[PDB]
Symmetry: C2
Subunit: 100 residues, 2 copies
């Protein structure tokens, strides 16, 4: 259970967000929302489902992260929920919440 | 990987069951497809119900009349891993009566 800190954006300026590398994308997204909306009135906060999680990697472009996609580990009838470690998200990664 | 034969019925309309060979490792979706193809043998595609409009009902005197699905509250979990439900998951026995119910 390695902790990480994300540089979270709502898409200009990044905010630190404490997460674990074994958090699912859903779990990490909650934690990001908690920091990013802290100063936003209740009535102005979007529904989380209208946002996607976008990892803007340093050197290799942007990627939408989700709990289930073409990358998910499958073994016969079994499937693993995608985590931050699954995607190889490093400590200090810039991650944006973007219109879905 | 045990073969099973189900006693398959339609739940609407007026011993009535027809035999359907399945595998116990078939998903509910897969079992449903095999049940429709036997029950509706001879009936053109255009005269068959959309499969998504039917639920699979296992009429057990022991477990109850259960609606079976590929994914539900009973699905096996292990950490972050979830398994699709099969006939073996529900422990549907050989010769089980299973109905297709308008859904």
């Amino acid at each position: 259970y390695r902790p990480l800190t994300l540089n979270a954006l709502l898409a200009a300026q990044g905010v630190p967000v404490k997460v674990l590398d074994c958090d699912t994308i859903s779990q990490a997204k909650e934690k990001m929302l908690d920091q990013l909306y802290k100063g936003v009135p209740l009535t102005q906060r979007p529904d989380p489902r209208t946002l996607d999680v976008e990892w803007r990697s340093g050197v290799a472009g942007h990627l939408i992260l989700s709990d289930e996609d073409v990358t998910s580990e499958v073994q016969g009838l079994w499937r693993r929920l995608n985590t931050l470690q699954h995607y190889k998200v490093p400590d200090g990664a810039t991650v944006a919440l973007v219109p879905c």
